[PDB]
Design an enzyme around this catalytic site. Structure first.
Site, PDB file in Angstrom:
ATOM      1  N   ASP A 290       0.827  -1.198   0.000  1.00  0.00           N
ATOM      2  CA  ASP A 290       0.000   0.000   0.000  1.00  0.00           C
ATOM      3  C   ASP A 290       0.869   1.259   0.000  1.00  0.00           C
ATOM      4  O   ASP A 290       0.542   2.249  -0.650  1.00  0.00           O
ATOM      5  CB  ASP A 290      -0.994   0.002   1.174  1.00  0.00           C
ATOM      6  N   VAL A 296       0.467   5.783   0.193  1.00  0.00           N
ATOM      7  CA  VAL A 296      -0.666   6.043   1.098  1.00  0.00           C
ATOM      8  C   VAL A 296      -0.964   7.525   1.325  1.00  0.00           C
ATOM      9  O   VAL A 296      -2.106   7.900   1.614  1.00  0.00           O
ATOM     10  CB  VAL A 296      -0.537   5.323   2.483  1.00  0.00           C
ATOM     11  N   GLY A 297       0.054   8.371   1.197  1.00  0.00           N
ATOM     12  CA  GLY A 297      -0.133   9.785   1.462  1.00  0.00           C
ATOM     13  C   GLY A 297      -1.100  10.449   0.501  1.00  0.00           C
ATOM     14  O   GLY A 297      -1.886  11.320   0.889  1.00  0.00           O
ATOM     15  N   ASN A 373     -10.164  -1.157  -0.950  1.00  0.00           N
ATOM     16  CA  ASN A 373     -11.081  -1.592   0.097  1.00  0.00           C
ATOM     17  C   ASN A 373     -10.606  -1.213   1.503  1.00  0.00           C
ATOM     18  O   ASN A 373     -11.428  -1.127   2.426  1.00  0.00           O
ATOM     19  CB  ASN A 373     -11.278  -3.108   0.027  1.00  0.00           C
ATOM     20  N   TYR A 374      -9.298  -1.014   1.683  1.00  0.00           N
ATOM     21  CA  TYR A 374      -8.754  -0.700   3.003  1.00  0.00           C
ATOM     22  C   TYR A 374      -8.840   0.746   3.394  1.00  0.00           C
ATOM     23  O   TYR A 374      -8.715   1.635   2.562  1.00  0.00           O
ATOM     24  CB  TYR A 374      -7.303  -1.057   3.155  1.00  0.00           C
ATOM     25  N   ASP A 375      -9.029   1.002   4.690  1.00  0.00           N
ATOM     26  CA  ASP A 375      -8.825   2.348   5.230  1.00  0.00           C
ATOM     27  C   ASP A 375      -7.969   2.213   6.486  1.00  0.00           C
ATOM     28  O   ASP A 375      -8.266   1.385   7.356  1.00  0.00           O
ATOM     29  CB  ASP A 375     -10.157   3.051   5.556  1.00  0.00           C
ATOM     30  N   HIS A 425      -1.311  -7.647   7.372  1.00  0.00           N
ATOM     31  CA  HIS A 425      -1.015  -6.248   7.086  1.00  0.00           C
ATOM     32  C   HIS A 425       0.287  -5.989   7.828  1.00  0.00           C
ATOM     33  O   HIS A 425       0.290  -5.954   9.061  1.00  0.00           O
ATOM     34  CB  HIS A 425      -2.111  -5.312   7.637  1.00  0.00           C
TER      35      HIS A 425
HETATM   36 BR   LIG Z   1      -8.825  -6.340   5.307  1.00  0.00          BR
HETATM   37 CU   LIG Z   2      -7.184  -7.395   6.912  1.00  0.00          CU
END
Ligand SMILES: [Br-]
Ligand SMILES: [Cu+2]
Ligand SMILES: [Br-]
Ligand SMILES: [Br-]
Ligand SMILES: [Br-]
Ligand SMILES: [Br-]
Ligand SMILES: [Br-]
Ligand SMILES: [Br-]
Ligand SMILES: [Br-]
Ligand SMILES: [Cu+2]
Ligand SMILES: [K+]
Ligand SMILES: [K+]
Ligand code: NA
Ligand code: NA
EC number: 1.4.3.21
Lengths: 620, 620
Positions: A290, A296-297, A373-375, A425
């Site tokens: 990511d 990510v920034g 999908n991630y935050d 992660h």
């Molecule tokens: Br996830």
């Molecule tokens: Cu996860």
């Protein structure tokens, strides 16, 4: 003023102008990365030379370039063409997110695959997924994205509820070619929606939550000067922002009596990767850096007062480049505030009759980003007692798949027919240390159990040992929770009043590290993630544990290449790289939108001070 | 009319009258412990019978007794004389705290020892320290306390700053004999004071902290009924208090749509011990069962608004007995409040365009206690998402000694000549489980790495395994942080909508367990502390992991004794006992009064719900 000030819109426009003037930014060029460079070592006396580094992509197929410019002097310092097959592709561009789906929409193999599943192409979203390096020879030197499909029933539908399993496609985003379409067979597309704002799924909303009001009638206890210099309760630092790493902390120091005492020169999350553990060919290639691949920034959210950040908030609004070198502000992208943190110290004494209680506080510097999908929320905390802490908060929507009829050893079931592949992660914190200055060293400290016998007749004794890591070759370390293993960064030339070197102790959470087989591509590409702690000698060009170009890049760069130099780290300018992560076996409770889970680390003073540093905190 | 309501003053004075009239509370008697008994299993088809359990000490030498009375009916149910050499001595009495000092004040050996050190006997405090069981045969069946000396220069002086090393005495508090005085030689008494309220030490107080105001305009979101029944955001529970264990939670349940679903029947900290790791004969016997020997509940502090507890606070004021059976209120001894807890769930979706954020909060139930030099806060947290957490906060003043010339492998230096012996603080949480009811089982869950090869050609796969603990003999488990080991409590007869048993997952911090040699007295008396997780079959009389009478008990009592029964625990009424602790090598920053450090554990739902349980939380 300060050489550590945030990039301004003018600086970014000036970089654009300088690149344009130099013939390096014509209409076919795109900025894939742009960031300001930290000042060189020993520059303190030197006048400002604000320098920016840029990765420049070419949409017509020409080689990209890495360029450093001086905005101060209006010059290109260096410009080199990149051989991406060798050193890596540039980060994914936001303007490429839609390209995968657009190219597939007219591909006969893709349409046949959708037709086999009775899916309307107009409703099929395709995720722009980083490709990694695998067995497909034609991908070497090509800018590839892979695509996985998810059905969106209507414009506001959560497509994640409707993964299309058994299907994956590979696309060359520069030549606009679909290179491969792989269909391993039809799986039912899960039918239940995952719309967490739909009352039919939420039910009636709770009316039971009474408001909590957090105010500061006299304002916050911290000051902000020069735009991003923070002073709070003896702490001093500068808050930077980089489009790749996100929030970066500079010059963390603590005012102890009359001296401003450095602790950490630069703290950042220098990489984070999400490796998937499902052996299906549909997803077995999935490893999302990511930070290194997506940056990510650049996806930092604008944070809403009262919702994202509660209390008396001071915002920073960092500026980044768009794909053409124009400045773009991320309004309210960084939240800063102090908060109460319970009891600091307390004692009621049976002999003196004195009862004493003091409360604690922490300063918080945070931002929240969204990658597909991630935050993720990235939080740095400074405490009254000298403790420094980082916390990541992971939420968003889980990455989904079909759930196989006969069950799975690598995927959990979230809803009828809906699966969530196991994954991790994994973060890398890069801590450029400066305990009382740059002369530092690291010791590994283990608890030591002792055998009952002479000198320990009751068998109660226990002890500890410290091992100095003297050379980079011996500084790749693993956790040992059972033996209470920690790592102390000390300054062998600066001693406390008891004649011991001042230090800070790093406390890890001791979560599992990278689980992949060591013979895997991801074990090489995310090598940093296989060990909990690395120590290097500081170098200008050693910024990320995965190297400068992670996208479609094999092993060969990053931490394993740095440590090979086997440099002296015993009383030298050193950098600690700490791997820490979440291993996520998704639960039903994670669906359809996941409650925050957290992971992090902290450092506590260890004979840094001559006594508690919070005796001067008042009762009020 | 809840059977789980707090004991009232009236009940206690009724216990007193019952005992007195039965001739069990003459002038030589002292109540060492008194508490209300929980209702037995399946006695819900029965009216009130509030029963109290009492340990009665005799200051004149007669045998102590364990008595059970019914306050409902005004009768003695049982009274048994105890053989303390067999089953253990009774808990230390507060009124004995000054007794060691007083007995030594007239002992010629002690006075010789002080005279040699030029210490005025009137200024020498002696700590009332539990004795343990070692090599002294004369001690079997005698009520012994040991004493270590600390100089108090004036009434308000912190004696901890001035330990008198090389000296220890043993006393029989009943016969009033000083049995032994041991002087191994003169150590300098450290001279610096540790008076943390002295401006000379604190310096000028900070003027930089601006107020943080936390209010609830409409009051708190939780309700309290029947004195101690709490309802908050779907959670239901009763808050109990016992003089030994402190705050106890009963009947923890969660309202999931139509049904109130039980999760934990009883949660408590059932023991906590502080074993010391200094092999000097002056301290090598030191192991303080703060809960089992001293009773942490009786020393609960009165908590001040705006100081100990901040925000909209609702207090409970539990009542306990004094040594004579008189009711004593601990005013504001329990704090209850809700607090904001950051982001609960957040996602901004690239395809739906929906941006979603919700805030988290937690219900807090806490108390703070003081045992000699230590002060501990015990905190239970319930979160919106179903998570249950415990946190202990350790502060106070470190237990001190001389710092030896030449240094030490078992003692830290805090100030010139002032040492702090290494030790641990180890807790045991007793969790009488009731996941959707009493039919529960526990599984140990490990991450499982997979080898690259057929079925895993890219070497990315990873998995997990679960092992049911079926009998007590296989239910004594250790941590394995490296494989991400956790323990799941599930109900094999209650399934979620996906046809899987509902469960809760215990996440430990994986700190070191008891370090002492396995052949030591403390390893035998605190066997619980040698392993991270134990599971027993529920039984009425199995209350503490160390047995009922910990003081001077020879060893093996409690968990080792329960486990030896080897009972079926696979789908039965079971109890989880989690050991967790701090291993403390004191740092200079810990002196003269220590900043809070923390340890704990949490349980998260694991397929307990059919989807996220917080979709009905409003935007706010
Ligand atoms: Br996830
Ligand atoms: Cu996860
Ligand atoms: Br061009
Ligand atoms: Br469709
Ligand atoms: Br925040
Ligand atoms: Br590779
Ligand atoms: Br009597
Ligand atoms: Br509290
Ligand atoms: Br302590
Ligand atoms: Cu301690
Ligand atoms: K310029
Ligand atoms: K009665
Ligand atoms: Na450094
Ligand atoms: Na149970």
């Amino acid at each position: 003023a300060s050489p550590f000030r945030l990039a301004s819109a003018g600086e970014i426009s000036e970089v654009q102008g300088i690149l344009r003037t130099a013939g390096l930014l014509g209409p076919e060029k795109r900025i894939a990365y742009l960031g300001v460079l930290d000042p060189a070592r020993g520059a303190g006396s030197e006048a400002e030379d604000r320098r920016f580094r840029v990765f420049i992509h070419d949409v017509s197929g020409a080689r990209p370039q890495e360029v450093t410019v001086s905005v101060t002097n209006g010059t290109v310092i260096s410009a080199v063409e990149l051989d991406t097959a060798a050193t890596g592709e540039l980060p994914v561009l936001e303007e490429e997110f839609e390209v995968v789906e657009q190219l597939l929409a007219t591909d006969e193999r893709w349409l046949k695959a959708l037709a086999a599943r009775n899916l309307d192409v107009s409703k099929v979203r395709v995720a722009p997924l980083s490709a990694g390096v695998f067995e497909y020879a034609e991908e070497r030197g090509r800018r590839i994205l892979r695509g996985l499909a998810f059905v969106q029933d209507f414009p506001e539908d959560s497509a994640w509820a409707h993964p299309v399993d058994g299907l994956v496609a590979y696309v060359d985003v520069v030549s606009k070619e679909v290179t491969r379409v792989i269909d391993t067979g039809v799986f039912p597309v899960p039918a239940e929606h995952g719309n967490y704002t739909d009352p039919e799924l939420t039910g009636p909303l709770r009316t039971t939550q009474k408001p909590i009001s957090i105010t500061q009638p006299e304002g916050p206890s911290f000051t902000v000067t020069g735009g991003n210099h923070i002073e709070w309760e003896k702490w001093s630092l500068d808050v930077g922002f980089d489009v790749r790493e996100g929030v970066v902390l500079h010059n963390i120091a603590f005012r102890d009596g009359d001296r401003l005492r450095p602790i950490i020169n630069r703290a950042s999350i220098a990489e984070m990767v999400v490796p998937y553990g499902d052996p299906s060919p549909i997803r077995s290639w999935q490893n999302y850096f990511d930070t290194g691949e997506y940056l990510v920034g650049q996806y930092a959210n604008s944070l809403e007062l009262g919702c994202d950040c509660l209390g008396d908030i001071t915002y920073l609004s960092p500026v980044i480049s768009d794909a053409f070198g124009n400045p773009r502000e991320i309004r309210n992208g960084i939240c800063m505030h102090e908060e109460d943190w319970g009891i600091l110290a307390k004692h009621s004494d049976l002999w003196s009759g004195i009862n004493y209680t003091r409360r604690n506080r922490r300063m918080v510097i945070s931002f929240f980003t969204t990658i597909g999908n991630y935050d993720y929320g990235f939080y740095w905390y400074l405490y009254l007692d000298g403790t420094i802490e980082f916390e990541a908060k992971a939420t968003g929507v889980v990455f989904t798949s079909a759930f196989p009829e006969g069950g799975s050893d690598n995927i959990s079931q979230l809803a009828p027919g809906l699966g969530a592949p196991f994954h991790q992660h994994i973060f890398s914190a890069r801590l450029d240390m400066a305990i009382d200055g740059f002369t530092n060293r690291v010791e590994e400290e283990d608890v030591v159990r002792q055998t009952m016998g002479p000198g320990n007749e009751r068998g109660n004794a226990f002890s500890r040992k410290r091992t100095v890591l003297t050379r980079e070759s011996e500084a790749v370390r693993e956790a040992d929770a059972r033996t209470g293993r920690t790592w102390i960064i000390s300054n062998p030339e600066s001693k406390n009043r008891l004649n011991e070197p001042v230090g800070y102790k790093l406390h890890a959470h001791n979560q599992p590290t990278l689980l992949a087989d060591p013979g895997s591509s991801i074990a090489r590409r995310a090598a940093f993630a296989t060990k909990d702690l690395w120590v290097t000698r500081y170098a200008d060009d050693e910024r990320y544990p995965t190297g400068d170009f992670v996208n479609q890049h094999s092993g060969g760069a990053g931490l394993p290449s740095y440590i090979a130099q086997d440099r002296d780290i015993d009383g030298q300018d050193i950098v600690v790289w700490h791997t820490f992560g979440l291993t996520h076996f998704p639960r039903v409770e994670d669906w359809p939108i996941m409650p925050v889970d957290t992971v992090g680390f902290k450092l506590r003073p260890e004979g840094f001070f001559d006594r508690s540093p919070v005796l001067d905190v008042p009762a009020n």
